[PDB]
């Protein structure tokens, strides 16, 4: 599993030396982040608002349907066994036809509420079935589809009529300003980075990767040549080190 | 109109929506897509597009050696949006239809008040001033049965139509997150 | 009015057949009929768990037909205007949201969208992070709903022969509400099928939990429970009633 | 008074048209209000040309 997260960091452009050189740090930032889920669950009852609303909106629509039986609908009494015991079958069929017309309209109102509400849950189950496949069983490059930040992995948890994910996301925290430049003249050639950008702490230039400050000496293994200096807007001067040169110097 | 058909105002005014689409717009321009991940990180915009070209497999020497060309192909492409908007009124057909299909369904609901539904007159104050309360309760029970069916028809049209907009807002909320705040590798999801 | 009737015309009507203008049958002038001022009354309140104090929103009137604050949604009475801008707590409409704060009362305010933050942009300045954090967010989705089924005969005409014979005259209104509530209740077993049952086999953890130093014991199942559910699954099963 | 005989047909059409009108403030909430702060442009617009 220490080699799984090094795949997961490669999926977000962070070179896997960030993982192994900080494995005890990420183990304590991951375990302490699980430990804050419980204190975000064992105290705040409003965390489960999307799932308690599914239970509430159906116990509401049944307890509205049951209370429709106590309505007269124009008839003399809402109790059907009180019309049959107090009226004659020529007259009683007028009163009962007002209740059947009234109650059957109350079912068609209820079923139409259920077809539309179950078309909302199916659109929220196919969203959950997409987040199960693309975000648990893989790693998603879709921004803010799997929690705010660069996504690493998810862990599903069951829930009463629903699913709860634990999106484990990578979020960059502590920054520094840097004077950058898109290009470097060395001998008139314009060296561009293979992976990352050029920065400078103020005196010397370094190529580093995009999402974690890891400065490296600018060599020809980091940079590739294209064209010459006269075209790129913002090119700076620097020496670009050559690894092959001190080999053949000795 | 006066028949209890109020229109509630939206929560977010049109000035506040034009502050989110400046905050979503000044973060895309100045900070790349890192304002969607964590804190916004400034980056020169000529170096943002070199990330964006690396996302589509084009080596970033294409950008810097053709930066004045892309600046004139991008500015002239914004300039054709206005001439595609300031003349063709049928460009906004998906949004004018949302306004039309709701002013249609209210002006069908209001015109249901002029129907007799079997009763002698569609004016309820003309039954009460012309009939006796044993007989008038027969006529009014035809209007209440008729008008309440016209509301349940209207609300059922609104629940189904608002389930179409929510499926088109969650598509817009997906294109806001995956396509403004990042770069999408999904073909023909973003133009 | 300025509605110039013709000298044979008596009533002016609306779209909805109600009379909009009449002609006075003694002094022949033309009179509009505007119905009297009306509007919805909404009661903005915090919970009665907190307080019993309310503030009343008269929807879509002015503050004449009735501390007294004016919105674009109507005349808000009972809530104090505050120049400060907070996050939205009880949404009113047209940018105003109300809340219960501190000596305590209900305040109303133009809501705030977030803290203003100008990015220190320039044409050669990049801001690369030096350190990170691993945040575990939680996303909670509904999957299924309650599989109900309504007996269309026992609901309408419960234990009555004289009513069930009248129900047969309406035809198949009964035998399609049992079909529509079955077509829901089938796919509620398909929604739970598609979300969870994607793995073809049932994998299980090795007995030694040396996952690089990480600690998954708060999400893996607990064998000491009678239903072998995790610790976080047991917190979720007690927060939903 | 005749409408009260039908029961809660009134008090569920006001609930169904509120359950729409709440999420119309949630649709605009989910689409636009995704950014946590309000960023604004620098006063000098040298965005690469």
XYZ file of C-alpha atoms in Angstrom, chain B:
191
model
C -51.706 37.962 -11.412
C -54.226 39.049 -8.787
C -55.403 35.442 -8.431
C -52.804 34.439 -5.871
C -50.209 33.525 -8.503
C -47.243 35.296 -6.945
C -43.704 35.116 -8.288
C -41.093 34.752 -5.605
C -37.795 36.574 -6.164
C -34.582 34.547 -6.407
C -32.178 34.412 -3.504
C -29.097 35.524 -5.415
C -29.598 38.781 -7.283
C -28.202 39.338 -10.758
C -25.479 41.512 -9.256
C -24.306 38.650 -7.043
C -24.230 36.211 -9.947
C -21.987 38.689 -11.724
C -19.674 38.543 -8.726
C -19.291 34.789 -8.820
C -18.594 34.864 -12.546
C -15.931 37.399 -11.820
C -14.515 35.279 -9.015
C -14.665 32.171 -11.186
C -13.218 34.297 -13.953
C -10.405 36.073 -12.143
C -9.218 32.782 -10.726
C -9.076 31.043 -14.084
C -7.138 33.934 -15.564
C -4.665 34.689 -12.799
C -4.375 31.415 -10.904
C -4.754 28.604 -13.414
C -6.902 25.828 -12.063
C -5.330 25.627 -8.622
C -8.104 27.753 -7.169
C -10.318 24.690 -7.475
C -7.916 22.429 -5.623
C -6.667 24.563 -2.768
C -5.444 28.105 -2.370
C -5.175 30.117 -5.562
C -1.632 30.194 -6.906
C -0.573 32.981 -9.233
C 1.123 31.980 -12.475
C 1.864 34.100 -15.565
C -0.811 33.498 -18.135
C 1.642 32.686 -20.898
C 2.771 29.856 -18.631
C -0.745 28.710 -17.895
C -1.461 27.928 -21.538
C 1.765 25.960 -21.690
C 0.276 23.725 -19.040
C -2.938 23.648 -21.045
C -1.095 22.596 -24.192
C 0.660 19.869 -22.224
C -2.761 18.555 -21.269
C -3.559 17.838 -24.915
C -0.206 16.340 -25.856
C 1.088 19.422 -27.668
C 4.625 20.233 -26.578
C 4.778 23.730 -25.072
C 7.291 24.978 -27.634
C 4.247 25.346 -29.867
C 2.852 27.950 -27.483
C 5.851 30.188 -26.867
C 7.006 30.185 -30.459
C 3.474 31.127 -31.546
C 2.310 33.327 -28.704
C 1.543 36.379 -30.835
C -0.369 34.138 -33.231
C -2.533 32.617 -30.501
C -3.137 36.031 -28.963
C -4.584 37.180 -32.272
C -6.562 33.976 -32.774
C -7.989 34.213 -29.271
C -8.884 37.904 -29.305
C -10.461 37.641 -32.746
C -12.456 34.635 -31.576
C -13.924 36.606 -28.686
C -14.710 39.347 -31.201
C -16.798 36.934 -33.247
C -18.911 35.961 -30.229
C -20.461 39.426 -30.079
C -21.338 39.459 -33.768
C -22.771 35.996 -33.180
C -24.773 37.473 -30.280
C -25.618 41.053 -31.285
C -27.398 39.941 -34.472
C -28.753 36.390 -34.136
C -31.583 36.411 -31.605
C -32.008 32.625 -31.881
C -28.708 31.921 -30.116
C -30.424 31.923 -26.702
C -33.062 29.380 -27.614
C -32.498 27.120 -24.631
C -33.009 29.985 -22.173
C -35.849 31.789 -23.902
C -37.675 28.460 -23.924
C -37.419 28.252 -20.136
C -39.092 31.656 -19.897
C -41.675 30.789 -22.557
C -42.693 27.405 -21.156
C -43.456 28.956 -17.768
C -45.314 32.009 -19.003
C -47.282 29.549 -21.128
C -48.160 27.314 -18.199
C -49.244 30.235 -16.045
C -51.333 31.777 -18.819
C -52.983 28.422 -19.333
C -53.677 28.193 -15.601
C -55.213 31.669 -15.494
C -57.416 30.969 -18.512
C -58.876 27.934 -16.731
C -60.760 30.344 -14.477
C -62.973 31.319 -17.415
C -64.312 27.790 -17.897
C -67.720 26.665 -16.724
C -66.763 23.035 -15.897
C -70.435 22.114 -16.094
C -71.549 24.884 -13.758
C -73.804 27.675 -14.954
C -71.212 30.458 -14.753
C -67.464 30.670 -14.324
C -67.816 33.664 -11.986
C -68.102 32.382 -8.438
C -69.601 35.664 -7.231
C -72.374 35.255 -9.811
C -73.472 31.886 -8.460
C -73.590 33.191 -4.883
C -75.664 36.207 -5.917
C -78.062 34.190 -8.091
C -78.608 30.865 -6.317
C -79.848 29.502 -3.023
C -77.409 27.670 -0.677
C -79.018 24.251 -1.210
C -78.659 24.632 -4.975
C -75.491 26.755 -5.060
C -73.438 24.054 -3.337
C -74.087 21.814 -6.333
C -72.729 24.393 -8.773
C -69.728 25.404 -6.667
C -68.717 21.760 -6.214
C -68.320 21.568 -9.989
C -65.979 24.554 -10.056
C -63.858 23.410 -7.113
C -63.586 19.959 -8.672
C -62.625 21.591 -11.941
C -60.168 24.179 -10.683
C -58.389 21.862 -8.249
C -57.816 19.467 -11.125
C -56.313 22.394 -13.012
C -53.828 23.046 -10.214
C -52.795 19.406 -9.918
C -52.244 19.416 -13.654
C -50.148 22.569 -13.285
C -48.069 21.370 -10.333
C -47.400 18.037 -12.036
C -46.173 19.988 -15.048
C -43.943 21.978 -12.729
C -42.480 18.991 -10.884
C -41.548 17.314 -14.156
C -40.202 20.507 -15.688
C -38.200 21.351 -12.577
C -36.780 17.838 -12.723
C -35.535 18.727 -16.193
C -33.861 21.930 -15.018
C -32.205 20.168 -12.085
C -30.805 17.612 -14.505
C -29.616 20.584 -16.551
C -28.217 22.362 -13.517
C -26.240 19.334 -12.385
C -24.903 19.176 -15.918
C -24.005 22.850 -15.612
C -22.528 22.296 -12.160
C -20.421 19.514 -13.634
C -19.256 21.698 -16.513
C -18.443 24.418 -14.009
C -16.214 22.180 -11.936
C -14.597 19.998 -14.567
C -14.297 22.482 -17.397
C -13.710 25.937 -15.872
C -11.802 24.933 -12.721
C -9.702 22.447 -14.652
C -9.098 20.946 -18.050
C -11.245 18.115 -19.332
C -9.966 15.056 -21.164
C -13.572 14.153 -21.990
C -14.048 14.474 -25.738
C -16.924 16.795 -26.767
C -17.825 17.509 -23.167
C -16.338 20.993 -23.481
C -16.944 22.098 -27.042
